[PDB]
Ligand binder design. Structure first.
Ligand SMILES: *[C@@H]1O[C@H](CO)[C@@H](O[C@@H]2O[C@H](CO)[C@@H](O[C@@H]3O[C@H](CO[C@H]4O[C@H](CO)[C@@H](O)[C@H](O[C@H]5O[C@H](CO)[C@@H](O)[C@H](O)[C@@H]5O)[C@@H]4O)[C@@H](O)[C@H](O[C@H]4O[C@H](CO)[C@@H](O)[C@H](O)[C@@H]4O)[C@@H]3O)[C@H](O)[C@H]2NC(C)=O)[C@H](O)[C@H]1NC(C)=O
Ligand SMILES: *[C@@H]1O[C@H](CO)[C@@H](O)[C@H](O)[C@H]1NC(C)=O
Length: 443
């Protein structure tokens, strides 16, 4: 009764955490590149810094499919048809990749990010049944997708391998590689329709292409960036024959929520979520609205604890405009960068739950407290406390030599709070309507 005691049971383990992150696809990287130098550095710091930012540990890039950079389109490394799929692809590398190469180089070389996930939303138009990287259509040569122009399946595998090679030659290792996005959805923008059976057919072609290549690191193939857990779970049966040839399951949080554990041997990443419809809000908590930082801290909780996610990526990091599609507002007029409390929600996770952490059991939670715990590779134990009540006296212990704690709330952005430590037990005052992380350090 001297506070509520949370007890971590290290002997009960769950999934590994690969990390937390976002994207700068569809020219959002270009928006960041336009800022003055101080704004560029502030945007990169708030995304990736483990000292003064969210410490995001994963970057997701788009493999551009478009003929040019009209609108927000991502130009392809091979934007012009070679006529026949038997002819060498025509590579036209611009040394930029829609400004994503720069963001990647900063993430890796400046901030120590080690996980780079490159995903194509479509093949180039000349490889597809409709001849266009937009408006759906399918990769020519897959079962049920004949094209007058012939079979482009091996050409698409060669093209994806070459994109990874261009990154390698620019000193960035792509670690994970996707070849579809929302394969169940036709849209006005870059989109491509594959069945689950077609995804397995293509993995059988892509895997040996990667393995035979001159790539120094062979990236892990991912599938399939469906728009929700329910749609992705429907694809896993057909994928199971190629489980030896890919190593990551990906899905978003749009058409359904990440609320159950999918039946796959692979780690599962939630690779895109956002309040796409909402006008810009910056607040941590007011009433649990769809754009509030509090809401997003709880969305991450749900994906990890209920959805068995090993990673969580918000859709976009920094971009211009007054929607909640992003975490960090760019004001091009002012040359300024202003994080929302959605950035700090994701960072309140990512700063303390580092890649390779193992989720472990913690008991003592309640109506007012939701808790989760993570054992980092360095032996630190991060205990997440999401508090929907008033200030709460909490003790945190293992069933350690020191402790620290940080909170995010309406007044704090991952700000240190007192963690009073005696004989292995941390005592904190978890602020009202906060997400607090208490970290127990080993001797
Ligand atoms: C939440 O999400 C996580 C993923 O993030 C899910 O974790 C996965 O859980 C499954 C089920 O427990 C794990 O599968 C098991 O893996 C073990 C370990 O295999 C490795 O080490 C073995 C030595 O200890 C070794 O023999 C294995 O080698 C084989 O497998 C590799 C890989 O396929 C292959 O290359 C080799 O040639 C071998 O064939 C491997 O290196 C494995 O031992 C399990 O199988 C045995 O035991 C089961 C009974 O538990 C039995 O039924 C089998 O017949 C067999 O005897 C099994 O495959 C998987 O590794 C986890 N994935 C990750 C990434 O951690 C988790 O399940 C999700 N939770 C929920 C609630 O859904
Ligand atoms: C790999 O590199 C060698 C030597 O440069 C080259 O001859 C070969 O064609 C390359 N293979 C591919 C698939 O790029």
């Amino acid at each position: 009764q001297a506070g509520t005691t949370l007890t971590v049971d290290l002997s009960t383990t769950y999934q590994r955490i690969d990390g937390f992150g976002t994207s700068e696809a569809f020219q959002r990287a270009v928006q960041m590149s336009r800022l003055p130098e101080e704004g560029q550095r502030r945007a990169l710091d708030v995304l990736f810094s483990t000292t003064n930012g969210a410490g995001l540990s994963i970057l997701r890039n788009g493999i551009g499919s478009s003929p040019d950079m009209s609108s927000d389109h991502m130009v392809s490394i091979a934007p012009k048809s070679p006529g026949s799929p038997n002819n060498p692809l025509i590579y036209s590398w611009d040394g930029s990749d829609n400004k994503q190469l720069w963001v990647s180089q900063e993430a890796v070389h400046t901030y120590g990010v080690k996980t780079i996930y490159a995903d194509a939303w479509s093949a180039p138009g000349y490889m597809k049944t409709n001849g266009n990287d937009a408006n759906g259509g399918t990769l020519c040569g897959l079962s049920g997708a004949q094209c007058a122009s012939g079979d482009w399946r091996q050409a698409y595998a060669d093209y994806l391998t070459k994109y990874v090679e261009f990154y390698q030659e620019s000193n960035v290792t792509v670690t994970h590689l996707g070849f579809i996005n929302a394969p169940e959805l036709t849209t006005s923008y870059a989109s491509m329709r594959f069945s689950a059976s077609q995804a397995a057919e293509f993995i059988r072609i892509l895997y040996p292409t990667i393995q035979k290549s001159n790539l120094t690191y062979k990236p892990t193939i991912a599938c399939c960036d469906a728009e929700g857990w329910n749609s992705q779970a429907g694809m896993l049966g057909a994928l199971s024959s190629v489980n030896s040839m890919f190593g990551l399951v990906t899905a978003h949080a749009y058409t359904s929520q990440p609320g159950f554990s999918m039946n796959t041997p692979h780690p599962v990443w939630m690779t895109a979520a956002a309040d796409l419809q909402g006008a810009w809000t910056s607040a941590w908590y007011s009433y649990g609205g769809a754009g509030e930082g509090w809401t997003w801290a709880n969305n991450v909780y749900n994906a990890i604890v209920n959805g068995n996610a090993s990673a969580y990526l918000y859709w976009i990091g920094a971009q211009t405009g007054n929607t909640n599609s992003h975490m960090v507002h760019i004001d091009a007029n002012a040359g300024t960068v202003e994080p929302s409390k959605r950035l700090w929600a994701l960072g309140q996770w990512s700063r303390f739950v580092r890649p390779g952490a193992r989720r472990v059991a913690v008991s003592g939670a309640s109506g007012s407290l939701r808790t989760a715990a993570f054992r980092n590779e360095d032996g630190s134990v991060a205990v997440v406390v999401i508090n929907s009540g008033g200030d709460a006296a909490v003790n945190v212990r293992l069933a350690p030599a020191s402790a620290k704690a940080w909170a995010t709330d309406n007044s704090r952005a991952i700000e240190e709070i007192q963690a009073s430590f005696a004989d292995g037990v941390a005592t904190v005052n978890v602020p009202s309507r906060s997400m607090t992380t208490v970290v127990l350090y080993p001797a």
